[PDB]
Write an enzyme that holds these catalytic residues in place. Structure first.
Site, short mmCIF file in Angstrom:
data_model
loop_
_atom_site.label_atom_id
_atom_site.label_comp_id
_atom_site.label_asym_id
_atom_site.label_seq_id
_atom_site.Cartn_x
_atom_site.Cartn_y
_atom_site.Cartn_z
N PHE A 84 4.48 1.42 8.65
CA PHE A 84 4.60 2.36 7.52
C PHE A 84 5.62 3.47 7.77
CE2 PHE A 84 1.29 3.94 10.39
CZ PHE A 84 1.51 5.32 10.42
N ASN B 111 -1.57 -1.24 12.14
CA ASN B 111 -2.74 -1.57 12.99
C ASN B 111 -4.13 -1.45 12.34
OD1 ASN B 111 -4.46 0.74 13.85
ND2 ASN B 111 -2.66 1.52 14.96
N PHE C 293 1.68 10.75 1.21
CA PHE C 293 1.17 10.31 2.51
C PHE C 293 2.18 9.34 3.16
CE2 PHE C 293 -2.37 7.72 4.81
CZ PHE C 293 -2.07 8.33 6.01
N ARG D 191 0.86 -1.17 0.00
CA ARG D 191 0.00 0.00 0.00
C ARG D 191 0.90 1.22 0.00
NH1 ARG D 191 -3.05 2.66 4.77
NH2 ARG D 191 -4.76 3.87 3.78
N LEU E 205 -2.35 11.23 12.93
CA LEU E 205 -2.07 9.85 13.34
C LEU E 205 -1.46 9.77 14.75
CD1 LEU E 205 -0.43 8.61 10.00
CD2 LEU E 205 -2.87 8.59 10.66
N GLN F 232 3.62 1.56 3.03
CA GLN F 232 3.26 0.56 4.04
C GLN F 232 3.68 -0.83 3.63
OE1 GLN F 232 -0.80 0.87 5.28
NE2 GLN F 232 -0.88 -1.23 6.11
N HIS G 143 -1.38 5.66 16.03
CA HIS G 143 -0.37 4.68 15.60
C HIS G 143 0.89 4.89 16.40
CE1 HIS G 143 -2.80 3.72 12.02
NE2 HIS G 143 -3.17 4.98 12.17
#
Length: 164
Positions: free
Chosen positions: A111, A100, A58, A53, A120, A61, A124
């Protein structure tokens, strides 16, 4: 401090198919998270994993043996606790954090961000930061992906991860 040997480290190098990412780790603040990461790394658990991903601007991952986003687990055999810390924030780019799927559901996926992602914070676990190879993270983040899945058309992978 109590006596005894440990399995954490304060740095690692993620050797990817597009170059090396040097990561400082935070084992004092996040001992369980750094231990999970370090033990998986030495064990070769992440060897050949894809960055399944990737979202331009951004984060990138990885860490799922299945490559689907649904897989992977901790060195303890399931999920483990978040380790949030007020001094550890997604306030700079190239922050290394656990993926997660909810509070206290850390497994193996993680990531690396390419911009500040303050939303975040306290969602995370922040457990590292890239110190060399930021350009590699950026370039990975810019590979062509399927817009519907954010999965790169050509795999980007971890070869192995060397723990200092």
């Amino acid at each position: 401090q109590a006596e005894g040997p440990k399995r954490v480290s304060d740095s690692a190098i993620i050797h990817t198919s597009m170059g090396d990412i040097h990561t400082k780790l935070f084992p004092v603040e996040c001992p369980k998270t750094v231990e999970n990461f370090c033990v998986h790394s030495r064990n070769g658990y992440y060897n050949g994993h894809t960055f399944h991903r990737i979202i331009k601007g951004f984060m990138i991952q990885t860490g799922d043996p299945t490559g689907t986003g649904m897989g992977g687990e901790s060195i303890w055999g399931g999920e483990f606790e978040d380790e949030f810390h007020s001094t550890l924030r997604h306030d700079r780019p190239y922050t290394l954090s656990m993926a997660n799927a909810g509070s206290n559901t850390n497994g193996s996926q993680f990531f690396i961000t390419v911009v500040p992602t303050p939303w975040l914070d306290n969602k995370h676990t922040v457990f590292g930061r890239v110190t060399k190879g930021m350009e590699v993270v950026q370039r990975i983040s810019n590979v062509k992906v399927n817009p519907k899945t954010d999965k790169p058309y050509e795999d980007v992978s971890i070869i192995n991860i060397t723990v200092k």
